[PDB]
């Protein structure tokens, strides 16, 4: 009881070996100094640290970032669904394991093949053919980190919060490699970009472009194999549907 | 040397005073009371100190307050006002008649 | 063109020969020159060309200086700095005859 | 994601709290428990029996299904021209079931905020979970069913 | 032009026209009661009640949402009965 | 006594200070600062600070309690290299040469434009409908350039904190300004540059963006690269040729341009001896650069599907028809 | 406030006399003398101890208690002091608060709503009946329905009428339709609200009709006021744009009459195409009067130059009657160009005084601006 909490914030650029810069999360940017014992090497630009609420001195670096939303979207329990519990999709089921399972289980194989593995692939079809079921099966049987997305719930009202959520979920996948991201009903945000609209169009297209930068390039996702499904693949932006 | 140390002492004594906010006026309500807009927070009706003649406070004067009792302190230079001012508004265009020929 | 709204009809004709030369001279201050660059002869090679295009021939003479990566601004430069400028002011205009006729 | 009550100054956790969902969702649940009997519905015995065996039997028995092994039906849609009495059948089903009943119309879920409607849908389903044997009633579903 | 500048003079020398809103007519107001209620009364804050705990039913505890400000777990003043409070209820609370 | 006073003056600028942005000064001893707390304060400045360091966008440390401004704070991509070279680019040599002149020429041949004279553009924009190798060429420049590339997306600029997102733009341009030869890449300028409460805040970040671009005249070697697929949007103010003159449109690859892309990618592959790439460069289907990769990648999977090593001719058209339409 | 207007604009010592008289009075007004030669303020201003904060109030719980919100958004149940004008406090207003306990300590000058701030047009003092040439039938008719009800309701009060609630002005463009209504505002004391029908057509679903509510709300607090709907035909003619315009139109008919009361505000509408608008506008129960604006005839035109040529310096060769004969070819707005172009024309002649030839070289250029067709 006699203890006290500590403010949390993310260390920015480093000036001297006793002067640091931390943005205290949604608060201001505070010039602070490391306490005594923390390995200065660990206090990388961007790492997450805790500060005394009195002297603001850093006293412990922490596991990278936040957002129990991603925690829920990972610990979602799909139930035991063997591939045999799905019927009449042998070609597709076999196809998916070639882009979702073999690369992360046996990456060294494609080194000799030379071809780099695809990172994302999309499931499209009329309602009631087993897309979500196939995703559940993949999540149940495979032994890796699996993210389950409802494309609606990753769309929050706070300004620029949905793009941030996409960024944090991708960061969680990168930190927990190998990881699988499943985005059901991707057409919820994957819709073609309106030329004009309300804050809805603005922020939805913003989140779409955020997800795009996340998966498209310059970051060359390492083990971030991704799966999405949609009942309306037509409405998807051509940027996504790009091979 | 004594002038230097006395200057340092004055500087130290002045350092204790707080930041006194920044405020802007859209009406000189009374000869004492002057309504101000602070940034952010909201609107305030504030009396002026002994100094600063009340005729000097004009709309959008960008004044400074004191830290407590708000209170008015001084006038400060005017704002820059860069809203729009990029695609529609141009302050001083760089084209003159001699830059044209034909 | 109605009462209380507008009062005249200022016209902008295509720049004349000496007029286009002045346009060249406007941007000619910065550019260097050889031992005898006669802008007069360069001026007459683009009949009916607009104003920004006369800047364009100076503009397209720009990266022709980068075509040799040193101070070029040569008399010959403008002769082909004319060449690539006019086609953009052109091409379908040839067909347009065979099109509209 | 859980909700705790902490020290207002030292921020130490001294509480465990019920989640709470939303004002709309709390207003969404039925506490009046209307009192229409199946007898007041007339000429729909096929439809009343259909809805009753679709919903109430999993609520009461749950052993007939497991004995047969089937998964009980989970979604029942009532449709027809207005005045046929769909709302009345829903009201009677609420009347007789004794289960946790959640009533709501389509416009109650639209909202203007970016994610608000999704939050209401998710949180209403969460409340139906936390109440365990529960029934959700959507009226004029086409409002969001467009 | 002299008329114009002299009018600007008159407007300045007259001073800023008092934008004072005014109060009620003097005969009705002030009294010592104004200072009395100013010094005595509580500056109550508005909030939205939520999900009465009622774990022990003696002091049932109340969660409120001071909208734009915060959320809290609070009790009642001894003057207001628990039967006087329902869920939500738009209840106002003290400042301390 | 004077030494003791200076020791205290050092003491007042100790570690726990709060950061703010220095607006215009007022007098010799006071100035106006915008705190990271959001509000602004009228603040007296310590004499020991060199006034010439003070600039209307400088990052300045304020006293934690008194907000007294005593400090000047010394304001990328080092290991996170894109890992790609110009050779492994799908033969957009016309685009390669243009960008070479666009950004590389201003650094390695900076002194030329005085003897050369003519002033090249100050920033570029690309339309490049999806799958047109914009990011590779952007990536290619990053691995090749001697500049200090800093990557941004339009989405990072829009935050939850009111009045912090627009401020983030300055850090982008301040950091590049400090690293004189650095290059800025702001791909997905779609988001922030949409045609003009919550609506204002996003456009404020664009408004702050527009101010920073104008400051990069000559004597600032930095160049800005902006990428966007749609590009029929974006406010004409940012489209202004006076500051984003040079633009590079990436069309769908044509024959020759197509053939380089197969040859480039297949060069790393194995392929059988009977592989007929010439049929695909001749096929009428308008496949973009991304498809070429996908057309080539799927060949490996088909080979690895049947446990086979070398890809034979039959592999490609199975893949070829599988992708595209 | 404003000064009176000198009677003759012509350069003369009579104007000198008037301006020097106003100078003398302004000099007697020139504050220096008076600037040369407690309990109420001391107590209550102590009660409202500085500094003061402004808050938005939307509640009145008791005659001494209400809910008040501040700019940050927090809401407070606070007490109202005695000196606060109870009638002045209404929801949506801005209220001064005590900085310590947030007690309500007075109402404030409302200064917001920029759009309607533009909407309460100036008194239109620049327009006057003296500036209108011979619209006799229009004047008496518009006097019947607009000016007189807003000046002497006594006839309507005694005789038992409910005065007409709406007038629509129709005529070719430039006939002076807007000028007349503006002159009515100057002639009366009522505040003037002007709106052009094209502007209220709004992109969003419901703002269009909302602006209509917003206007007639604005008219009501001003009490005697005029709402001028210029070029009404954009929102009234015949028939997702289709439904909203109908919805917008119906909003007018509900504020032009409909339910509840309408107070005192009068409504004036203008258009060029009366033969196109919805019968609901032509409805002689909804709109009681429709005023005709014909093209000016010979006598009306002569007044127009007399109105417009009053300010320039003229020659003796000017024959205004000759410029009149042809037809009702041009409206007064065109004739303003006739003066303006001539003034420029005589200026181009390097003469500060205009001649008849300048008017002929003024009349022709106005004519070429006309279109061509049916040769
Ligand atoms: N091939 C299949 N084998 C077994 N069950 C199947 C198959 N296809 C569909 N089903 C059954 O139908 C349902 C599959 O639908 P699911 O929830 O997976 O999503 P969907 O209908 O493909 O689309 P979405 O959830 O995106 O709207 C499950 O209840 C499953 O039992
Ligand atoms: N079969 C029925 N038995 C008894 N009453 C009925 C029946 N059908 C309709 N009603 C009457 O209909 C009235 C209200 O109609 P109800 O809303 O139930 O029908 P509906 O067609 O579902 O309409 P809506 O979809 O518009 O709600 C009730 O008061 C009830 O008396
Ligand atoms: N010429 C090319 N050669 C090889 N791959 C290409 C080529 N053009 C495009 N690509 C593919 O597209 C990407 C290049 O970026 P791109 O997708 O065009 O960016 P954007 O679509 O965001 O403009 C690479 O990841 C690559 O797989
Ligand atoms: N009978 C008239 N008397 C005075 N001025 C007139 C007359 N007719 C037209 N005008 C001139 O035309 C202008 C008024 O134009 P108006 O017809 O009100 O515009 P609209 O056609 O848009 O209603 C005024 O500036 C005025 O100078
Ligand atoms: Mg699904
Ligand atoms: Mg119903």
Question: DSSP assignment of C7-29, as one string?
Answer: ------PPP-HHHHHHHHHHHHT
Residue G296 CA: nearest ligand 4 atom is 1
Q: How far apart are CA G141 and CA G147, in angstroms?
A: 10
Residues of E in contact with D130 (CB under 8 A): none
The shortest CB-CB distance from G333 to any of C1, C3, C7 is to: C3
Dihedral of CA atoms E25, E29, E35, E36 in degrees, nearest 10, equals -160
Nearest CA residue ID for atom 13, ligand 3: F133
Among F61, F64, F86, F87, CA closest to F74: F61
Among F154, D118, F199, F192, CA closest to A198: F199
Q: Do G43 and E28 touch (CB under 8 A)?
A: no
Q: Which one of F40, F69, F195 would you mutate to disrupt binding with B, by most B Cβ within 10 Å of its Cβ?
A: F40
Q: Is the CB of F132 under 6 A from ligand 3?
A: yes
D123 to chain A: closest CA residue: A153
Chain B adjacent subunits, 3+ CB pairs under 8 A: C, E, F, G
Q: Residue written as tokens 């508005």?
A: E46
Q: Do B29 and E15 touch (CB under 8 A)?
A: no
B40-72 burial, b if ≥16 CB within 10 A, otherwise e?
eebbbbbbbeeeeeeeebeeebbbbbbbeebbb
Q: How far apart are CA A241 and CA B10, in angstroms?
A: 69
Contact G174, G263 (CB under 8 A): no
Among A69, A58, A56, A64, CA closest to A28: A56
Contact F207, F220 (CB under 8 A): no
Structure tokens at G281: 């506008």
Q: How far apart are CA G247 and CA G101, in angstroms?
A: 47
Structure tokens at A13: 């650029």
| Touch criterion met for B and E (3+ Cβ pairs within 8 Å) | yes
Resolution in A: 3.6
Query: Which residues in G have their CB inside 8 Å of a CB on B?
Result: 50-55, 70-72, 94, 96, 109, 111
Nearest CA residue ID for atom 5, ligand 4: G132
Among A27, A20, A13, CA closest to A57: A20
Q: Is the CB of F260 under 6 A from ligand 3?
A: no
Dihedral of CA atoms F154, F187, A28, E47 in degrees, nearest 10, equals 20
Q: How far apart are CA F319 and CA F302, in angstroms?
A: 8
Contact B55, E12 (CB under 8 A): yes
B97 to chain C: closest CA residue: C26
Chain F adjacent subunits, 3+ CB pairs under 8 A: A, B, C
Contact F224, F124 (CB under 8 A): yes
Region of residue C69 (left: phi > 0; alpha: psi -120 to 50; beta: else): left
Sign, CA torsion C53/C59/C63/C68: positive
Torsions phi, psi for A148 (to 5 deg): -110, 125
* C-alpha distances in Å from residue A38, one per residue of A17, A20, A33, A42, A50: 11, 13, 11, 8, 12
CA atoms within 13 A on the CB side of G312: 27
Sign, CA torsion D118/D124/D127/D129: negative
At a CB cut-off of 8 Å and minimum separation 6, what does A113 contact? F270, F300, F303, F304, F309
* C-alpha distances in Å from residue C52, one per residue of A82, B100, C49, D20, D41: 70, 12, 9, 67, 82
Measured over all CA atoms, what is the biggest interatomic distance in chain C, rounded to whole angstroms?
A: 58
Q: Do C7 and G344 touch (CB under 8 A)?
A: yes
Torsions phi, psi for D80 (to 5 deg): 155, 170
Q: How far apart are CA G348 and CA G333, in angstroms?
A: 22
State the CB neighbour count (10 A cutoff) for residue B38: 18
3-state secondary structure of E66: strand
Measured over all CA atoms, what is the biggest interatomic distance in chain E, rounded to whole angstroms?
A: 85
Q: DSSP for A198-236, please give it.
A: SHHHHHHHHHHHHHHHHHHSSS--SS--EEEEES-GGGB
Contact F308, F286 (CB under 8 A): no
- Distance between Cα G331 and ligand 4 center (Å): 8
Contact G110, G120 (CB under 8 A): no
Among F184, F193, F107, F91, CA closest to F138: F184
Burial of A234: CB neighbours in 10 Å, binned 0-12, 13-18, 19+: exposed
Residues enclosing ligand 2, CB less than 6 A? D 40-44, 82-88
| Minimal C-alpha gap between C8 and chain G (Å) | 10
Sign, CA torsion G335/G341/G346/G349: negative
Q: Which one of B3, B4, B6, B11 would you mutate to disrupt binding with F, by most F Cβ within 10 Å of its Cβ?
A: B11
Bridge partners of A149, per DSSP, are A183
At a CB cut-off of 8 Å and minimum separation 6, what does G109 contact? B27, E19, E21
Q: How far apart are CA B18 and CA B67, in angstroms?
A: 6
CA atoms within 13 A on the CB side of D59: 19
Peptide bond into F16 cis (omega under 30): no
Structure tokens at C93: 């205009």
State the CB neighbour count (10 A cutoff) for residue D68: 9
| Minimal C-alpha gap between F105 and chain A (Å) | 23
Structure tokens at D54: 């679709």
Structure tokens at E88: 């939500």
Q: How far apart are CA G66 and CA A207, in angstroms?
A: 43
Structure tokens at E69: 């400000």
Q: How far apart are the first and last CA of chain C?
A: 33
CA angle F224, F225, F230 (to 5 degrees): 135
**H/E segment holding residue F279:** helix F277-282
Percentage helix, strand, coil for chain B under 3-state DSSP, each rounded to 5: 20, 25, 60
Q: Do D26 and E48 touch (CB under 8 A)?
A: no
Q: Is F135 annotated as a binding residue?
A: yes
Sign, CA torsion G239/G241/G247/G251: negative
Structure tokens at C7: 């009062």
User: What is the pairing mode between strands A29-32 and A19-23?
Assistant: antiparallel
User: What is the pairing mode between strands E92-93 and E44-46?
Assistant: antiparallel
Bridge partners of F223, per DSSP, are F183
Secondary structure E strands in chain G? 52-57, 65-69, 75-79, 93-98, 104-107, 166-170, 191-196, 225-230, 266-271, 289-292
Residues of D in contact with A69 (CB under 8 A): 1
Q: Do F118 and C62 touch (CB under 8 A)?
A: yes
Structure tokens at F85: 């070279």
3-state secondary structure F135-151: HHHHHHHHHHCCCCCEE
Structure tokens at A177: 């490699």
Q: At what angle do helices A90-100 and A131-141 cross, to 10 degrees?
A: 50
* DSSP letter (8 states) at residue F101: I
């Amino acid at each position: 009881l006699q203890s006290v909490g500590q403010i949390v914030g993310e260390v920015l650029k480093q000036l001297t070996e006793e002067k640091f810069i931390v943005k205290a999360t949604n608060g201001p940017r505070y010039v602070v100094g490391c306490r005594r014992q923390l390995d200065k090497s660990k206090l990388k630009p961007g790492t997450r640290v805790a500060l005394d609420m009195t002297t603001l001195t850093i006293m412990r670096y922490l596991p990278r970032e936040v957002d129990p939303l991603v925690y829920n979207m990972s610990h979602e329990d799909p139930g035991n669904v063997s591939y045999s519990e799905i019927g009449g999709l042998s070609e597709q089921i076999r196809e998916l394991r070639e882009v979702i399972e073999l690369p992360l289980t046996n990456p060294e194989l494609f080194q000799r093949v030379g071809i780099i593995p695809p990172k994302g692939c999309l499931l499209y079809g009329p309602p009631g053919t087993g897309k979500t079921l196939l995703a559940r099966a993949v999540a149940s049987q495979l032994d890796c980190n699996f993210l389950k997305v409802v494309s609606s719930s990753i769309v929050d009202k706070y300004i620029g919060e949905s793009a941030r959520l996409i960024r944090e979920m991708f960061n969680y996948a990168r930190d927990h490699q190998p990881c699988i991201i499943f985005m059901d009903e991707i057409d919820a945000i994957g819709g073609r970009r309106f030329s004009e609209g309300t804050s809805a169009d603005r922020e939805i297209q913003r989140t779409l472009m955020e997800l795009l930068n996340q998966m498209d390039g310059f970051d060359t996702l390492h083990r971030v194999k991704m799966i999405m499904a949609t009942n309306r693949p037509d409405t998807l932006d051509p940027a996504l549907l790009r091979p | 040397l004594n002038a230097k140390v006395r200057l340092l002492r004055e500087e130290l004594q002045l350092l204790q005073e707080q930041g006194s906010y920044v405020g802007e006026v859209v009406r000189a309500m009374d000869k004492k009371k002057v309504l101000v807009k602070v940034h952010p927070e909201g609107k305030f009706v504030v009396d002026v100190d002994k100094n600063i003649d009340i005729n000097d406070v004009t709309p959008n004067c960008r004044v400074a307050l004191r830290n407590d009792s708000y209170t008015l302190h001084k006038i400060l230079p005017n704002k820059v006002d860069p809203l729009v001012s990029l695609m529609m508004v141009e302050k001083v265009p760089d084209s003159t008649y001699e830059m044209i020929g034909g | 063109l109605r009462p209380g709204r507008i009062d005249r009809k200022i016209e902008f004709p295509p720049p004349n020969e000496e007029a286009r030369l002045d346009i060249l001279k406007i941007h000619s201050r910065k550019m260097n020159l050889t031992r005898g660059i006669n802008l007069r002869k360069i001026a007459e090679l683009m009949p009916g060309a607009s104003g920004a295009e006369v800047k364009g021939v100076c503009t397209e003479a720009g990266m022709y200086a980068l075509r040799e990566r040193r101070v070029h601004v040569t008399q010959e430069d403008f002769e082909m700095a004319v060449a690539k400028v006019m086609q953009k002011d052109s091409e379908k205009n040839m067909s347009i005859k065979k099109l509209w006729k | 994601g859980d909700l705790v009550g902490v020290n207002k100054d030292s921020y130490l956790i001294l509480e465990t709290l019920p989640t709470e969902y939303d004002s709309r969702v709390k207003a969404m649940e039925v506490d009046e428990r209307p009192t229409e009997q199946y007898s007041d519905i007339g000429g729909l015995d096929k439809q009343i029996q259909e809805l009753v065996e679709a919903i109430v039997l999993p609520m009461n028995h749950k052993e007939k299904f497991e004995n047969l092994g089937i998964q009980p039906p989970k979604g029942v849609l009532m449709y027809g021209p207005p005045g046929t009495g769909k709302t009345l059948l829903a009201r009677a089903c609420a009347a007789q079931t004794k289960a946790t009943f959640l009533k709501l119309a389509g416009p109650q879920l639209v909202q203007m905020f970016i994610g608000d409607g999704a939050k209401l849908v998710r949180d209403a389903f969460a409340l139906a979970k936390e109440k365990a044997p529960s029934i959700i009633f959507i009226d004029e579903l086409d409002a969001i069913g467009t | 032009d002299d008329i114009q500048q002299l009018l600007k003079k008159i407007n300045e020398l007259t001073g800023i026209k008092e934008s004072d809103t005014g109060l009620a007519p003097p005969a009705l107001w002030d009294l010592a009661a104004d200072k009395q209620t100013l010094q005595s009364e509580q500056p109550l804050q508005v909030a939205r009640c939520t999900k009465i705990i009622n774990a022990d039913s003696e002091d049932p505890k109340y969660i409120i949402n001071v909208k734009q400000f915060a959320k809290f777990v609070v009790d009642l003043s001894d003057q207001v009965a628990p039967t006087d409070i329902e869920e939500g209820m738009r209840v106002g609370v003290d400042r301390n | 006594e004077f030494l003791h006073a200076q020791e205290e003056v050092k003491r007042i600028q100790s570690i726990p200070l709060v950061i703010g942005q220095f607006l215009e000064a007022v007098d010799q001893n006071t100035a106006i600062v915008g705190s990271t707390t959001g509000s602004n304060y009228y603040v007296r400045i310590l004499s020991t600070i060199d006034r010439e360091l003070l600039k209307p966008n400088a990052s300045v440390a304020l006293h934690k309690h008194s907000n007294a401004l005593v400090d000047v704070l010394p304001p990328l991509t080092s290991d996170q290299k894109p890992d790609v070279m110009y050779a492994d680019i799908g033969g957009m040599d016309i685009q390669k040469q243009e960008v070479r002149e666009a950004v590389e020429l201003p650094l390695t041949h900076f002194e030329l434009y005085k003897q050369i004279g003519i002033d090249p553009p100050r920033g570029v924009l690309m339309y490049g409908p999806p799958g047109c190798g914009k990011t590779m060429l952007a990536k290619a420049v990053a691995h090749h350039t001697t500049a200090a590339f800093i990557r941004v997306v339009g989405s990072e600029f829009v935050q939850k904190y009111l009045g912090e997102g627009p401020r983030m733009v300055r850090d982008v341009f301040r950091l590049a300004k400090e690293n004189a030869p650095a290059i800025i890449f702001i791909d997905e300028i779609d988001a922030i540059a949409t045609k003009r409460g919550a609506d204002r805040e996003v456009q404020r970040i664009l408004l702050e963006l527009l101010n920073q671009m104008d400051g990069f005249d000559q004597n600032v070697n930095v160049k800005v690269i902006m990428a966007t697929n749609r590009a029929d949007t974006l406010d004409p103010a940012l489209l202004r040729p006076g500051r984003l003159d040079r633009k590079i449109e990436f069309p769908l690859p044509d024959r020759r341009q197509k053939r380089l892309i197969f040859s480039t990618i297949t060069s790393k592959m194995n392929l059988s001896e009977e592989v007929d790439l010439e049929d695909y460069v001749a096929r009428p289907d308008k496949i973009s650069g991304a498809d070429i990769n996908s057309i080539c990648q799927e060949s490996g999977m088909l080979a690895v599907r049947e446990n086979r090593y070398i890809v034979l001719a039959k592999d490609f058209e199975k893949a070829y028809k599988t992708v595209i339409k | 406030s404003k000064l009176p207007l000198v009677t003759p604009h012509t350069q003369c010592r009579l104007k000198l006399l008037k301006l020097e008289r106003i100078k003398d009075y302004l000099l007697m007004e020139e504050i220096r003398n008076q600037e040369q030669m407690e309990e109420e303020r001391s107590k209550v201003d102590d009660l409202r101890g500085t500094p003061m904060s402004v808050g938005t109030l939307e509640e009145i719980i008791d005659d001494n208690h209400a809910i008040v919100s501040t700019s940050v958004g927090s809401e407070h149940y606070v007490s109202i002091l005695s000196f606060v004008d109870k009638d002045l406090l209404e929801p949506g207003c801005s209220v001064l608060l005590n900085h310590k306990v947030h007690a309500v300590i007075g109402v404030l000058m409302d200064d917001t709503d920029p759009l309607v701030t533009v909407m309460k047009v100036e008194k239109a003092p620049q327009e006057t009946y003296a500036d209108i040439g011979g619209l006799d039938n229009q004047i008496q008719e518009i006097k019947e329905s607009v000016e007189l009800p807003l000046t002497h309701p006594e006839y309507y009060e005694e005789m038992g009428i409910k005065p007409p609630k709406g007038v629509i002005l129709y005529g070719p463009p430039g006939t002076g339709k807007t000028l007349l209504a503006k002159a009515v505002a100057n002639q009366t004391s009522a505040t003037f609200l002007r709106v052009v029908g094209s502007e209220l057509i709004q992109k969003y679903l419901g703002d269009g009709p909302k602006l209509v509510r917003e206007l007639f709300r604005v008219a009501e607090e001003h009490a005697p006021s005029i709402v001028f709907i210029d070029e009404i035909d954009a929102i009234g003619t015949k028939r997702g744009g289709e439904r909203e315009i109908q919805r917008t139109m119906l909003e007018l008919l509900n504020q032009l009459d409909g339910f509840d009361s309408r107070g005192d505000v009068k409504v004036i509408m203008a258009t060029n195409r009366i033969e196109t608008l919805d019968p609901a506008l032509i409805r002689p129960g909804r709109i009681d009067r429709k005023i005709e604006f014909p093209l000016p005839d010979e006598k009306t035109k002569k007044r127009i130059f007399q109105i417009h040529t009053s300010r320039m310096t003229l020659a003796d060769d000017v024959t205004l009657d000759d410029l009149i004969m042809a037809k009702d070819d041009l409206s007064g707005a065109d004739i303003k160009a006739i003066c303006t172009e001539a003034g420029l024309m005589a200026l181009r002649e390097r003469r500060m005084k205009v001649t008849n030839e300048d008017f002929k070289k003024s009349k022709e250029n106005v004519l070429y601006k006309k279109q061509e067709g049916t040769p």
